[PDB]
Design a binder for this molecule. Structure first.
Ligand SMILES: Nc1ncnc2c1ncn2[C@@H]1O[C@H](COP(=O)(O)OP(=O)(O)O)[C@@H](O)[C@H]1O
Ligand SMILES: [Mg+2]
Ligand SMILES: [Zn+2]
Lengths: 202, 224
C-alpha cells in the first residue's frame, strides 16, 4: 500500500492510498516509509462490495425464460441468467520500482563501506573523499546543515553527532550496548527547538 | 445425389497405402474420405454446399468377399464385403443426426450434437441454467437422417452341405435406404460392427455381443 506524497495534497484533503502489485523481480523493492517511483499500469480489479444500491451488472444475452415451477425469478432467476455485479476498484500493477530521490546515481542493490562506495559514481566519491579529507569538516557540516539558524552552535554539533552515531556492540553475556546517541533540546519559547527537529526531519 | 462411389481397384492401383488402410480402420478412413470429397466437390461446385453439405463415399469392388457364415470376431471394425438375400426391411425411419435439445427448465436450445451410431447422445448441463435436469429433443431445430434396418441372409444356393442359412442385420443410412427390397439379392459392403448397446449384460446368458453391418455400399444383382 502506498499513499499520496505530502506535496501532492489538495486543500482540506486526506492523502489518497492505492495498493500496488509487485511481481516477479520487483517483489521486495519498496519498504514501508520509502519514497518510491512506481512504473507500470493502472488496472481495475473486480472487488466484492455493494449495498450502496444495486448497480451495474452482467447477464447473459440469451433470452431464456423459466417454465412454470422454474420461473426465472428471485435467486434462482439471478443464478440462471448468470447475473453478477460489475463492481471494480483501481489498483496499480508495477513492473518496476525505483526510489524517487536516489541517493547515489550509480546503482542500488549487504551494505558494507565498499558496497556503498561502489554504489556511487566517480564524481560522487570524489566529493565524499574530498569532504572526508576536509579539515574543518565539523564546522562545515554544522553550517551547511543549519544555515538559517543563528547561534546555538553546541546544539548543531550535538545533532550532527547524533546523525553520525556511535558503534553498537554485543557483550559475550548477551548484553546489547547502545550505539547511537539521543539528544533532547529543552528551552524557552521560540528558541528554535522545533526548527532543529524540522531541519533533521527534512 | 450426395454420394460418391469410389472403385477400390482404382484406389488401390493409384494409391495402395490408403487402400490397405481402408479395410482396417474404415470408420476413420471413410470420415476422412467424406471430408475430402466435400472439399473437392465444393471446389468444383461452390453452390453445392446448400444442397447436401455432406458427401458419402461408397467403396466398390472390394476384394474382401466373405460369406455371412464366415464373419468372426477377427472381422470386427473392418470393412467387409458380403452377399445375400434381403429377407426383411423396416420402413425408412428418421434418426437424429444433429440433435438440438430443449432445456425444459429454462427453454434454452442446446446446440447441435452429432448422433453417433454407437450410443445415445445425452447432454450434461444446460449451458445457461446449468441444470442437469430433463431435456427433450427440439424436433424443429434438429436435423434427421434416413435410417433403415435390413436383414440379409445367405442365398439358399450358396448354403449347400445341409445346414442352415445365416443372417445379419445391416443398417442403411441416408442414401442407401430403399435401395434393397425383401427378396433382392445384393452385395453388401460395410463395417462389421460390435459396439453400440447390445452386449447381453443382463445375465440372460453368456456375455455375447450382437453384431451389425453398417452398410457402406449396396449393389443389387439384377437388371434395372
Ligand atoms: N538563532 C535563533 N534563535 C531563536 N529563534 C530563531 C533563531 N533562528 C531562527 N529563529 C526563529 O524562531 C522561530 C521560532 O522557532 P520554533 O522552533 O518554532 O519555536 P520553539 O523553539 O518554541 O519550538 C522560528 O521560526 C525560527 O526561524
Ligand atoms: Mg516547538
Ligand atoms: Zn436451462
Amino acid at each position: 500500500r502506498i499513499q499520496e506524497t505530502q506535496a501532492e495534497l489538495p486543500r482540506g484533503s486526506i492523502p489518497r492510498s492505492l495498493e500496488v502489485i509487485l511481481r516477479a523481480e520487483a517483489v521486495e523493492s519498496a519498504q514501508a516509509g520509502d519514497k518510491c517511483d512506481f512504473t507500470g499500469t493502472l488496472i481495475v480489479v473486480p472487488d466484492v462490495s455493494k449495498l450502496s444500491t444495486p448497480g451495474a451488472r452482467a447477464e447473459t444475452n440469451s433470452r431464456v425464460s423459466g417454465v412454470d415451477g422454474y420461473e426465472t425469478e428471485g435467486i434462482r432467476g439471478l443464478r440462471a441468467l448468470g447475473v453478477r455485479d460489475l463492481s471494480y476498484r483501481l489498483v496499480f500493477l508495477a513492473c518496476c520500482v525505483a526510489p524517487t530521490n536516489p541517493r547515489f546515481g550509480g546503482k542500488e542493490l549487504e551494505q558494507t563501506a565498499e558496497s556503498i562506495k561502489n554504489q556511487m559514481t566517480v564524481k560522487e566519491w570524489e566529493k565524499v573523499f574530498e569532504m572526508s579529507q576536509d579539515k574543518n569538516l565539523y564546522h562545515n557540516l554544522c553550517t551547511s546543515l543549519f544555515p538559517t539558524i543563528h547561534g546555538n552552535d553546541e546544539v548543531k554539533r550535538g545533532v550532527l553527532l547524533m546523525l553520525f552515531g556511535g558503534v553498537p556492540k554485543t557483550t559475550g553475556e548477551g548484553t546489547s550496548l547502545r550505539g547511537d546517541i539521543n539528544v533532547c533540546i529543552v528551552g524557552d519559547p521560540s528558541t528554535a527547538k522545533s526548527q532543529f527537529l524540522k531541519h533533521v526531519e527534512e | 445425389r450426395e454420394s460418391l462411389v469410389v472403385n477400390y481397384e482404382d484406389l488401390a492401383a493409384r494409391e495402395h497405402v490408403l487402400a490397405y488402410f481402408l479395410p482396417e480402420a474404415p470408420a476413420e478412413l471413410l470420415q476422412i474420405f467424406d471430408e475430402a470429397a466435400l472439399e473437392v466437390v465444393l471446389a468444383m461446385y461452390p453452390k453445392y454446399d446448400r444442397i447436401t453439405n455432406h458427401i458419402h463415399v461408397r467403396i466398390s469392388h472390394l476384394p474382401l468377399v466373405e460369406e455371412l457364415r464366415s464373419l468372426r470376431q477377427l472381422h470386427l471394425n473392418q470393412l467387409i464385403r458380403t452377399s445375400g438375400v434381403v429377407t426383411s426391411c423396416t420402413g425408412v425411419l428418421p434418426q437424429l443426426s444433429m440433435v438440438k435439445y430443449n432445456c425444459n427448465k429454462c427453454n434454452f436450445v442446446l446446440g447441435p450434437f452429432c448422433q453417433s451410431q454407437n450410443q445415445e447422445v445425452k447432454p450434461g448441463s444446460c449451458p445457461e441454467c446449468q441444470s442437469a435436469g430433463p431435456f427433450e429433443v427440439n424436433m424443429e431445430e434438429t436435423i434427421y437422417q434416413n435410417y433403415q434396418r435390413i436383414r440379409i441372409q445367405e442365398s439358399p444356393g450358396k448354403v449347400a452341405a445341409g445346414r442352415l442359412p445365416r443372417s445379419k442385420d445391416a443398417i442403411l443410412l441416408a442414401d442407401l435406404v430403399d435401395s434393397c427390397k425383401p427378396g433382392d439379392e445384393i452385395e453388401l459392403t460395410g463395417i462389421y460392427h460390435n459396439n453400440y448397446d447390445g452386449s447381453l449384460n443382463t445375465a440372460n446368458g453368456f456375455p455375447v455381443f450382437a453384431t451389425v453391418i453398417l452398410a457402406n455400399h449396396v449393389a443389387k444383382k439384377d437388371n434395372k
